[PDB]
Symmetry: C4
Subunit: 313 residues, 4 copies
């Protein structure tokens, strides 16, 4: 929970079939870290590549005066799991995640280090003038609002990989064993102070079905409200059907029969009341189902910064 100036930096980079980009990535990333004036290390994690990426990483770590640690996985498990493997081997005070495709320039690293020295626990980035499609642009805005309400911190670009975390944030994320989650969201759940800064990127150009799968992951990770709306929806339908049934009953007695299908309409009104009550029942199940999920994840409830005892005198 230290707010002291940073002394060492750790860089975490997942690798999966990056044979062509590695020589340039290592050179540019190394130069930027040397300009910090601090101790540093670089972690390369191979996620079961098949294009000689592992051979290059071993050679780099054996090079004279190297600061590169190579972690090799037995097979492909995912980018999220590869990052968590790196978190378990870091030794620095500030942790920075980066992409191996060189979409995010390594030259932006010094800016994040300087911003963190001002006391921010988490430092994010926002890509400027990326000119995405309207559907994707609109979706990003919706996600940003949802994260702001739930976590209290904003996220302009949830999909950007360039971010900085302080060590106390990383240690607690290692205490969360939930399989479905999003690391940037998890950090803001424990962060006290956060900010974002603008960055530039390489020109563009996941798939559509990957995007829709991601929407469910975000919503389930953030809120259980959708299960609450089932009961609200049902109560509206149930009340509407009940009111119409009474109106038809009272209307015909005070005004005599009016339509040939008058009996059929009353039967439908009773049916709609039952349909609404079914939504309430499903929402009733949702209240228990949602609470089971929180207990299963078992996130930490609090973290203590310091305790002050009265003087023994």
């Amino acid at each position: 929970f230290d707010a002291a100036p940073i002394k060492k930096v750790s860089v975490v980079i997942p690798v999966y079939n990056e044979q062509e980009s590695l020589p340039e990535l290592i050179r540019r990333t190394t130069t930027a870290c040397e300009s910090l004036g601090k101790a540093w290390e670089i972690l390369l994690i191979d996620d079961g590549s098949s294009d000689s990426s592992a051979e290059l990483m071993v050679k780099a770590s054996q090079e004279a005066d190297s600061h590169i640690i190579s972690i090799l996985l037995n097979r492909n498990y995912g980018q999220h799991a590869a990052i968590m493997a790196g978190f378990s081997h870091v030794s620095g005070d500030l942790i920075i995640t980066l992409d191996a495709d060189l979409q995010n320039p390594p030259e932006e690293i010094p800016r994040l280090v300087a911003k963190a020295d001002e006391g921010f626990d988490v430092v994010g980035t926002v890509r400027q003038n990326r000119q995405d499609s309207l559907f994707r642009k609109s979706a990003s805005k919706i996600i940003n609002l949802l994260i702001q309400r739930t976590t209290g911190k904003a996220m302009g670009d949830y999909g950007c990989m360039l971010r900085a975390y302080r060590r106390p944030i990383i240690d607690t994320m290692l205490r969360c064993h939930e399989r479905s989650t999003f690391i940037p969201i998890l950090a803001n759940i424990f962060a006290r102070r956060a900010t974002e800064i603008p960055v530039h990127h390489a020109e563009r150009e996941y798939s559509f079905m990957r995007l829709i799968n991601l929407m469910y992951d975000l919503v389930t990770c953030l809120t259980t409200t959708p299960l609450r709306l089932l009961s609200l929806l049902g109560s509206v339908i149930a009340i509407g059907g009940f009111s119409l049934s009474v109106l038809l009953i009272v209307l015909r007695l005070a005004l005599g029969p009016q339509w040939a299908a008058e009996g059929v309409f009353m039967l439908f009104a009773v049916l709609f009341t039952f349909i609404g009550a079914q939504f309430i029942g499903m929402g009733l199940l949702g209240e228990y189902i949602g609470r089971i999920y929180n207990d299963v994840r078992a996130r930490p409830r609090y973290f203590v910064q310091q305790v002050i005892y009265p003087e023994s005198t």
Copy 2:
């Protein structure tokens, strides 16, 4: 599990942006504790405040001859989590929870200590002549009955913060890791002897949507009966539709056709039978869902007071 007289008292107070009230709270609370004639300590827990509350607490704990312990959290986590942080640092025999807004006078503390010395494990309070709205007043009565049936102990005011717990009660509540719960309810699940006494309070004046959210938390924490009512409701609907279908079939044969829409009515009757069977199915799922929730919470099953072995002679 001691019924012996109290020797030390611990006071737990959550703090969140109470800069204006702290100077008066510390003075009044300190005086009342000094009148007990017992050893005492006061715990102040800051839940990520932003109005210089943390600075005052540190100064108070460093004051000469102080009995104040200050616990600082890295960010805001909630009143419930802040209280649990205090429970993990207490050292007394009787634990008292209090509010930092001075709604509940600190001068009532000696009364609770005296009542606990008579052998009661839990001592509650009831606010007199608070003149709440009819909807809120009616809701409190319903909650009191529900808690009485389930726990065997009554609770006139579930929302009052001034309460006393003996150490054996606090230790077991620390063994319950359920995220959604209510501390006063949890205490009565392990208490042998309990009572409530009247108190006075400052004049009044959560929001409406906060109240409805709280109702679900209370019901889910107390009972799984609502999932049982789905099957009962369905059986009534299913039996009604089946009876009407038979009546129409028998009626027309013994009395000939009667209505133009006679065929349509029979189809509706068959439908209502299916609708009821759907409620049974959802209730069937509820039986398993509710039992999963109890196992996940994993509350203690029993506590042993003492064991008497026969004499070795």
Copy 3:
């Protein structure tokens, strides 16, 4: 896993407001145990009684040359929990459970010990000529068949308290932490050899709503089949509606219109197909829900009796 002759016997008796019966229970139970010719102990567990039962138990355990161990609970938790408390304090090779109301004579204890010496891991009892009501008598038969199919062992009377368990059976039941269960059922899940014998009892005369609650507990503890029947039921309804819809479509073209409400009937047939598909969906959820429950309970998968390694020569 020993099949050796029994050397010591442990008797477990839950107590809850048995002030009048205790003096006779202790005398009769003590005499029967002395006739065995083996070492023995008696455990009395008080489940938060309020009629001086605890005072008598302490006096009995302090009596000269006593074999009685008294376990006192801080409050009432249930008969099932009281029994589990006794299991955690036994020291014998054969464990016998008995009722404190003297409905089951203590004089039947020697018979169970003799039967267990023949090599049976579990020994049960069946009450003769109890002349229960037809509804209760029929329910017992249904439960017996269900337990036979699932466990491979029969149970004539699931409600009889007089039973004997060998130590290896008790130790494993202590490794099952499921809150909702039935001890006699759990024993047969690990027993290799079991039998039942007839006994006599005091003349009769739970409530009706207690009986229906118990039926759900038994079924959920034994099988998940009821969730499978939802899909089977839906497929029948869906196939029926689809067939009728085709018949109406083909029938009218090859035979012209026949009824005024012909269009309405086709709409109902389409509806019934949707209704059936809803049952399939609920059953689809049940497949996952039922498997979650088994993992949460986390019963032992196997127990090893002995391992024979080849001779070192």
Copy 4:
């Protein structure tokens, strides 16, 4: 994670009432293992047999110069549990599972050992010209495709028992405590390199209801997609009903009334919209239910092969 040549082989064989086949199985299996030129052991696990199988196994293990280890279970628990018992007692580098009914010849063992020496972590088998029924043949093809998509490895015959696993694969499967699963599927989730080879078998001739039960186990073990299809199905129904309702409303105003039952048709269209929304609600529950199941199983997220640190110079 060694790719080194195999030095010792372990054979695991579950036994349940194989009195007639054991003498031939032991002789043939022993000869094949002696031809390998490596150290070897054979494990026989008795799953609560009742036909003198246990007596023969003990005699075999006590025979002079024997390599047979006998593991006896207290009762029948299942073939899957019996295999896991063997995995906990193996001591070799390559693990081979075999059937005691001699359907799979033991003479195929040397082929699997040779194939594993080429660097494959898992080696499977495919039965040739078994001439199964069309329904069973078609089902096998569907399962093979499903496993290929999910695991990245194919499985021609999921039901064949003859397979080889390297030690690193077995150790991790012991870290998966899920009760419902399929061992061959679990191995491919951690394997880097896998292959299958053809084998021959004895001529044929589970039951039908056993086959349908197995289909649910496979699908639940592999994917949660079926819960996603509920929402997709509902959206189609909801959109269709909404479109038809608008068409009827617009059509009649611009073309006047057309049918006597025009009002009834509109009511049905509104109903179908509600029916579809119910499918969405169930799918909404499925998103949470499916994620609870993955956390409960708690499979390992990754395995590290080696870590290369930079030279200290």
